[PDB]
Amino acid sequence: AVVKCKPTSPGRRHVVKVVNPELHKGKPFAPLLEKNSKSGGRNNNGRITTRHIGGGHKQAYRIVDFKRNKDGIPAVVERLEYDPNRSANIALVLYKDGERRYILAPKGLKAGDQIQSGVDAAIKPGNTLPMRNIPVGSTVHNVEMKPGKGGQLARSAGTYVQIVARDGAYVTLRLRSGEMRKVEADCRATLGEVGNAEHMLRVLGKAGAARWRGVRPTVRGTAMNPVDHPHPVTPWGVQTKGKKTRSNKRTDKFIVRRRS
Amino acid sequence: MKRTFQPSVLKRNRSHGFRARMATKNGRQVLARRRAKGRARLTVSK
RNA sequence: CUUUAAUGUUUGAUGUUCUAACGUUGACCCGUAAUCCGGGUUGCGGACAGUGUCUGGUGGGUAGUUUGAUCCGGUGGUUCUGAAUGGAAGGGCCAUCGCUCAACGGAUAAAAGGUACUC
RNA sequence: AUCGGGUAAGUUCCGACCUGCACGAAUGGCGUAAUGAUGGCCAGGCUGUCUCCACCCGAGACUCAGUGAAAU
RNA sequence: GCUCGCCGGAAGACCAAGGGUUCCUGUCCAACGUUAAUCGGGGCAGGGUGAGUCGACCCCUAAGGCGAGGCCGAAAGGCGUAGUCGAUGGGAAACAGGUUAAUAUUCCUGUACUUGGUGUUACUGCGAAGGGGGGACGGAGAAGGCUAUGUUGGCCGGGCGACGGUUGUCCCGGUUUAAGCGUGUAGGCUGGUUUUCCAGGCAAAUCCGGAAAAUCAAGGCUGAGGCGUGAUGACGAGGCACUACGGUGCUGAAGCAACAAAUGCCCUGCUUCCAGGAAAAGCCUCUAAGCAUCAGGUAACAUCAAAUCGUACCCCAAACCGACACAGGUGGUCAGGUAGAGAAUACCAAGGCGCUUGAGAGAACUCGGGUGAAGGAACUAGGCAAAAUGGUGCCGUAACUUCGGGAGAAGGCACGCUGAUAUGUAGGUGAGGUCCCUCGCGGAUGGAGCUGAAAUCAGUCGAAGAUACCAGCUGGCUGCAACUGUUUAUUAAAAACACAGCACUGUGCAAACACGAAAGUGGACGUAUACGGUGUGACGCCUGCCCGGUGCCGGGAGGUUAAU
RNA sequence: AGGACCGAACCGACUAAUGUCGAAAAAUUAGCGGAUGACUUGUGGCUGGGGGUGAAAGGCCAAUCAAACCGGGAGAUAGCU
């Protein structure tokens, strides 16, 4: 749900929160947790490779399984949890054999729902099926470019891709960026669209929200001195604002249409 | 005000101790120069 | 020899297909109590991508600087010489020619500004 | 960023016009509640800021004893 | 030695880091102390630091360092695996009293506790770098139980007292006792017992997880405090005998109740919030390999060992950092009495100091203040500085507004003390007796006793009762910026910077971008609702025209175009 | 609940005064803004010089920064004092 806080004070006047009443109000599943030390934009050399990253509240990494190698094992959704690493809520899935994992929760998934992966799976949301079995003209998420990779496309909230064409061993996918990509049929994908589609409605209210979310203040180029910044060009002299940086010549064979 | 030098034995030893210097060749060269100059206090230590 | 045609040859530019080089920050097994790395199998692309030399364009992002003279010689004639011998190239001798190179005794063939952050 | 208000007296301030040297619509234009160790003006109280300074309380200043620099 | 003054959330006591004998005694004023000095943190000599229970040490680990093989790089060397280091964290254990001039949680006295080795006894399957649980965690906030602690009352010993009275409902001091042991309560968490089965826990498993059933409805875990033992012991006011007159020895009464109460414990608790809140080891359990007449483990007893290192002193300062015996800076713990909402403020207990130049006089002038006739900003670039209000309770509070605010707007009235309501009310706590009891730390009545606001009336003294310290000046117009916030350490705190929002642009993930000769990294263990860059800066109206010049995109008609 | 309100410790120095051979190579007195966070702090490390970091002032990088310090080219050059 989306709510607007009353203007009891500045910093709450413009706050819009995204409340999910069915999220688990308890500790996460410890066995699937993992430490995630913040980098602050530093690399092995210790220099700031990427700016505007630092601070923020501590967050523990959730081991979310994307490959979905449990084929032919029906499972039940125990509950839904909040994943700080992902913009979309995760779902705890318990299999019949007695093993628990974290999966990306689609829009139509709730506690107690039934899921089944593998080729022998239904068309209900949350199931994993190769595009060859999936009917053409369907919406999928968590798609793979290589078999066994795990899943790389449509992983954020409310993100999904459309299966448009079936050219033999290849399948054409339209992405949310307006890009047509050709992918092998043996790859896996998940039916439906990711949940928590209301992620846009949050506005973060004030500076502190972004500050503790992991973003540091950004300084405009004009305010910087000539030595520090060229001031449209990037801080390193690259002409931004309408210059294509795509120079690969390796994956272009899989490119069908560019963004528009 | 608090002056620049705030003593700390652990940091001093780990930043200018013999092991810290000799971990790299440059510190070994510094030690060689110190020995050539014949300074009684080769490095900082208790 | 001008003018044409099936055949076997040198072949290259381009198109389709294949794997054996090449990549795999795809998967499985071992060294291995190992997200490194290497090796064995397989799938995925594949003579593409990428890298090495040369080369066109862009490149204050960075680095060094500035704010008939001269060199070069165009042509001539002259076997004067011409690097072992004989030629030739290159120089020397006489003539002439190409720049208001006029900042005109002309310092480079090749160079504009700010500092009130200054020294 | 000429006319009226405030003072008897206002090159400041406010409101009205535009003869805009040389405002102007995201190097953004117009208002905006609340906010400000922000720029300016006015009004009520207040008082040594002033008319005009006067006295007193403590450390120096001055005398004595001991020690005892400086720039030039 | 007696007075006077100061700190007393410290100017007191412990420490952490940092110093290295500055700590005590004897001895001296050669040099130092901004003066003298017999003195000292000064000179010489002697003494002083006792640890199984404190910490280090040691087991594990985060950030991070090194890095066997390996990748890369002219060399040096850079990255990184397995591994090893790395407390700012997690792991086992002691309290009370006494003593030296200097050590004490180390020494002595009393009572204990923890980890391993060895041997005896009765049983039994043991066995991991492997698996499971726990270890193991955020912010904010309310209540209850308590306790450290303080007040009062009773009890004990003493006093009746030099200026009026004080055998009385009066004054002075004490009224303390730990760790461990057993009971386990307030409170919190969780439904248990048995059987059968399962491709899950990178092999297996009686262990965890999951699926079925039969049974009861209770059990299990955690848990401050209090109660008895510890303890007819120590301590204890005071008195007594000697003093190298500093001090030593003997003795030793009561050692209870109520109230209030913490930021400290129950509480890593409980309720909500999105910013979703370390890891490993010790610890309990299961088996793999191997052995099961062994070995090994469990339970009780006896014994041994627990090594090595620091233990002085200062630690908000004269001893540390500032060249100083420097008005500066330095992390944590304890932190009482009265008034006070309060760790503020005023005075004090414990405890510590009077800050290492003073003696005279009281000129101008300087520094910090007090008062002031009349005016009240007329001085000044500018109400700069000064001056004034300032608290509680009750009434009341404008324009605008994003409906929250403005606002404590502004502006009005009572604040002292005593008696009554009420031989102290409401409220809080709450004994003894009585009755039940699923029988003890169990439940009702009851109010004994203690504590105890707020309000009315009346009286009363003062010029003034928020009587001291503490403690907003107020309103209007207006440019700027949404606001909070940050900046030129050491002259500019702002309209500047930043900001949530907005628009453009790039990136299909071996993504773009940046550090890198390269490896490899951050982006991101994220992925188009995602990340980088650009410009503006909330919210409402909005954001009009122009593609000529320079960039960006796409094109290929036609000309130029190097290497070759 | 509040990047809420008044106000202690804590952070900083917005105004005035003293201090410029001062007690201090930016100090002291009273006012002053925040004081539950975009807060601060103890400890241990990482980012190293045409580079680091920087809510961006040409600010900080050991009292030195429009390019630190140390040793060398180096007795650099100086038509200048």
Coordinates of N, CA, C and O (backbone and C1' of nucleotides) in Angstrom, one line a residue, chain E residues 24-33 36-44 318 325 356:
Chain E
rC24 P 56.2 10.3 47.7 O5' 56.7 9.2 48.7 C5' 55.8 8.6 49.6 C4' 56.5 7.6 50.6 C3' 57.6 8.2 51.3 O3' 57.3 9.0 52.5 C1' 58.3 6.2 50.4
rU25 P 58.1 10.2 53.0 O5' 59.4 9.5 53.6 C5' 59.3 8.6 54.7 C4' 60.6 7.9 55.0 C3' 61.8 8.8 55.3 O3' 61.8 9.3 56.6 C1' 62.4 7.1 53.7
rG26 P 62.5 10.7 56.9 O5' 64.0 10.6 56.7 C5' 64.8 9.8 57.6 C4' 66.2 9.6 57.1 C3' 67.0 10.8 56.8 O3' 67.5 11.4 58.0 C1' 67.3 9.3 55.1
rU27 P 67.6 13.0 58.1 O5' 68.7 13.5 57.0 C5' 70.0 13.1 57.2 C4' 70.8 13.3 55.9 C3' 70.8 14.7 55.3 O3' 71.8 15.5 56.0 C1' 70.3 13.1 53.6
rC28 P 71.4 17.1 56.2 O5' 71.7 17.7 54.8 C5' 73.0 18.2 54.4 C4' 73.1 19.0 53.1 C3' 72.1 20.2 53.0 O3' 72.6 21.3 53.7 C1' 72.0 18.9 51.1
rC29 P 71.6 22.6 53.8 O5' 71.7 23.2 52.3 C5' 72.9 23.7 51.8 C4' 72.8 24.1 50.3 C3' 72.2 25.4 50.0 O3' 72.8 26.0 48.8 C1' 70.9 23.7 49.0
rA30 P 74.3 26.6 48.9 O5' 75.1 25.8 47.7 C5' 74.5 25.7 46.4 C4' 75.6 25.4 45.4 C3' 75.1 25.5 43.9 O3' 75.2 26.8 43.4 C1' 76.1 23.4 44.3
rA31 P 73.8 27.6 43.1 O5' 73.2 27.0 41.9 C5' 73.6 27.3 40.6 C4' 73.0 26.4 39.5 C3' 71.5 26.6 39.4 O3' 71.1 27.7 38.6 C1' 72.1 24.3 39.4
rC32 P 69.7 28.4 38.9 O5' 68.6 27.2 38.6 C5' 68.2 26.9 37.3 C4' 67.0 26.0 37.3 C3' 65.7 26.6 38.0 O3' 65.0 27.5 37.1 C1' 66.0 24.4 38.7
rG33 P 63.8 28.4 37.7 O5' 62.9 27.4 38.5 C5' 61.8 26.7 37.9 C4' 60.7 26.6 38.8 C3' 60.1 27.8 39.4 O3' 58.7 27.7 39.7 C1' 61.0 26.5 41.2
rA36 P 65.3 32.9 44.7 O5' 65.1 32.8 46.3 C5' 65.9 33.7 47.2 C4' 65.5 33.6 48.6 C3' 65.5 32.2 49.2 O3' 66.8 31.8 49.6 C1' 63.4 33.2 49.7
rA37 P 67.5 30.4 49.2 O5' 66.7 29.3 50.0 C5' 66.6 29.4 51.4 C4' 65.4 28.7 52.0 C3' 65.3 27.2 51.5 O3' 66.1 26.4 52.3 C1' 63.3 28.3 51.1
rU38 P 67.0 25.2 51.7 O5' 66.6 23.9 52.5 C5' 67.4 23.4 53.5 C4' 66.6 22.8 54.7 C3' 65.2 22.4 54.3 O3' 64.8 21.3 55.1 C1' 65.1 24.1 56.0
rC39 P 64.3 19.9 54.4 O5' 63.1 20.4 53.5 C5' 61.8 20.6 54.0 C4' 60.8 21.1 52.9 C3' 60.7 20.3 51.7 O3' 59.9 19.1 51.8 C1' 60.8 22.6 51.1
rG40 P 60.3 17.7 51.1 O5' 60.0 18.1 49.5 C5' 58.6 18.1 49.1 C4' 58.6 18.3 47.6 C3' 59.5 17.4 46.7 O3' 58.9 16.1 46.5 C1' 59.7 19.6 46.0
rG41 P 59.8 14.9 46.1 O5' 59.9 15.0 44.5 C5' 58.7 15.1 43.7 C4' 59.0 15.2 42.2 C3' 59.8 16.4 41.8 O3' 60.7 16.1 40.8 C1' 57.8 16.3 40.6
rG42 P 62.2 15.6 41.1 O5' 63.1 16.9 41.3 C5' 63.5 17.7 40.2 C4' 64.8 18.3 40.5 C3' 66.0 17.5 41.0 O3' 66.6 16.8 39.9 C1' 65.8 19.3 42.4
rG43 P 67.3 15.4 40.2 O5' 68.6 15.7 41.1 C5' 69.8 16.3 40.5 C4' 70.9 16.3 41.5 C3' 71.2 14.9 42.2 O3' 72.0 14.1 41.3 C1' 71.2 16.6 43.8
rC44 P 71.7 12.5 41.3 O5' 72.4 12.0 42.7 C5' 73.8 11.8 42.9 C4' 74.1 11.4 44.3 C3' 73.5 10.0 44.7 O3' 74.3 8.9 44.2 C1' 73.1 11.6 46.4
rA318 P 48.4 19.6 38.5 O5' 49.7 20.4 38.2 C5' 49.9 21.1 37.0 C4' 51.3 20.8 36.4 C3' 51.6 19.4 36.2 O3' 52.4 19.2 35.0 C1' 53.2 20.4 37.6
rA325 P 59.0 22.7 33.2 O5' 57.8 22.6 34.3 C5' 56.6 22.0 34.0 C4' 55.5 22.5 34.9 C3' 55.2 24.0 34.7 O3' 53.8 24.3 35.0 C1' 55.9 23.5 36.9
rU356 P 51.3 28.7 41.2 O5' 52.0 28.9 42.6 C5' 52.0 30.1 43.4 C4' 53.4 30.7 43.5 C3' 54.2 30.6 42.2 O3' 55.0 31.7 42.0 C1' 55.4 29.5 44.0

